[PDB]
Amino acid sequence: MLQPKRTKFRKMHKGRNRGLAQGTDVSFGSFGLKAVGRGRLTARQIEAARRAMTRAVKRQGKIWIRVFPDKPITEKPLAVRMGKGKGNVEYWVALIQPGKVLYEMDGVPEELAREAFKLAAAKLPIKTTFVTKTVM
Amino acid sequence: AKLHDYYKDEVVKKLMTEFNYNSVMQVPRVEKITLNMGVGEAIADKKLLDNAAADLAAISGQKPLITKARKSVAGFKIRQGYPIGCKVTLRGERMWEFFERLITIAVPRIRDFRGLSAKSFDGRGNYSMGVREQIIFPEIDYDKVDRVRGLDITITTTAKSDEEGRALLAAFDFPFR
Amino acid sequence: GIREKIKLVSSAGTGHFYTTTKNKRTKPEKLELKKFDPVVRQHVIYKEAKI
């Protein structure tokens, strides 16, 4: 499951998720799944969607995961009050903005690529759309 | 110096005809000769560094510069500023005199001497060679040596490449293998 | 720390003195310096003494 092998700091501010994505274009495969909504992808969600599409293509072709979950999310345990310092790190997320290409694929028919991405999108919280590599 | 005149009157002119250099200034020249003893055991007994320094003095005829550790290395238990070796750099007349002694009397005394390796060049016409034991130099009295110790010779030249550097040395009958 | 206070007393007949800190262990020999003495208005030798 995706995590940075090491990080300079352990905990991070919440921040905000304004703006539109860089990486709007298919760059390695011929087909891809593009984010249309906005939100967080957790490492678990990314992995679940990955497993879904590879099963659909029976491991044929190649798959690129374009997003990486590098942001640590903390939570406090149950029955604890406010204060007493920042909670412990629980899981890692990637911040998604509209337009980001999440996955790419090639080496399979388009009519199979659509089916594979349909199965994967069902695992992701954000809405997504199928896109193809343009000339230029 | 004797070999210096041999350079001026023969080596330079034959090299000119060999490589077809356009200017006499283009012909390679010997710039310096440097002797190094990496004593090392000066980490134990400083008299060893002194005794090694006396040997370079006798061989070279000038007081050696003792060389300090560039940086600490735990792999050898050396701290920075510890004496590790000593060097002598020879230039001008005393360079040619040593160079003459080395060829004419010193290297003949090497055990099982078959000639020096012709490939011991750094890639830019500087030749470097080790000697295993000090006794090749008659200035060291065999009856009085404390310990075996070798040294490195390095010859620095204005040559641009090993082919030019090798030609320069061979012109002195520098005994390549 | 081992850095300990001392005073330097004017070698002139004046009472004037400076105070300073000295590492007693590593430098056991007495500190001695020329310094201005404003009572005689001259540079004069000063010598270490007990605070």
Partner: protein
Amino acid sequence: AHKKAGGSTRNGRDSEAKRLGVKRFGGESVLAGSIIVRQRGTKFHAGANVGCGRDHTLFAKADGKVKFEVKGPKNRKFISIEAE
């Protein structure tokens, strides 16, 4: 259930803010001795009629107007005073 004790933070320290930065801006008239910049290191350099203190404070050595300028090969920022 039982109310459960929290832990403790290991952080919790900071130093007093030092009020660094530019104290007189371009075109501003100053008297001799006036401090122009409080710095850490020479983020600005002393130009004409400007001094540099032991803590790299730049100060006016003449009356005039403050001029900021970029000079030299390193494109370093110099402060100077122009006589009025």
